[PDB]
Structures are given as structure tokens and as C-alpha cells.
Amino acid sequence: SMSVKKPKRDDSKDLALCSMILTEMETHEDAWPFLLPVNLKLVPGYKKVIKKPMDFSTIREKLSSGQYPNLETFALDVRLVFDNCETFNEDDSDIGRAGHNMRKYFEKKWTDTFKV
């Protein structure tokens, strides 16, 4: 509360660590469905069904331009990528399984990097 300061973690490396994690995602073999925005004019249903689209390139732009206030908002956009993928794709489709694989891949790096 007012004048009662909770000790806080050192966040000074967060930008560079989130960037490294995103680089790992971008280079993963199963990243291809998520590297660019879904083409809203060529993919039936996407625009109406998926209320907040997100992809790695948009995340990279937001990270490179100071649009994430904290690491929690960065992980929200990452998780949004895979939530959208689950909403729109069958678990066993190529894109659907890629999303599941990428989510697991992300969450381990997140715990390994920040749950010190």
C-alpha cells in the first residue's frame, strides 16, 4: 500500500529474455502456421470467429517498439496465438498439433527462464 513497498524482482533483463524466447519460437520447425498474420481475405471464418488475431511477427513488432509494458503482457500475446489456434483447428490437424507443440515449447522456456 501507500509507502509500503513490496520487494520486486529485477526486471531489467526482461526485454532481452523475451526476445530470445521469441527467437526460439520463430525458428522452431513447427512455427510456420504462426509466423505471419492469418490472411483474413483467404481463410474462411477466421475474421468473424477469431476476435483478437495474433502471430509471431506482430509480437516481434510490439516487442521491438515498446508496446509490452511488462513480461506478463508479452506472455498473454504468446498464449493468445495458441488459444486462437485451438479455437479454429482440430487437435490432430497439422496446424492444430503444431499449436499444441508450440504451447508446450513456450511454457517450458517461460518457467525455465523466469521461474528462477
Ligand SMILES: Cn1cc(C(=O)NCC2(N)CCCCC2)ccc1=O
Ligand atoms: C494459425 N492458423 C494459420 C492458417 C493458415 O492459413 N496458415 C498459413 C498458410 N495457409 C499460408 C502460408 C503457408 C501455408 C499455409 C489457418 C488457420 C489458423 O488457425
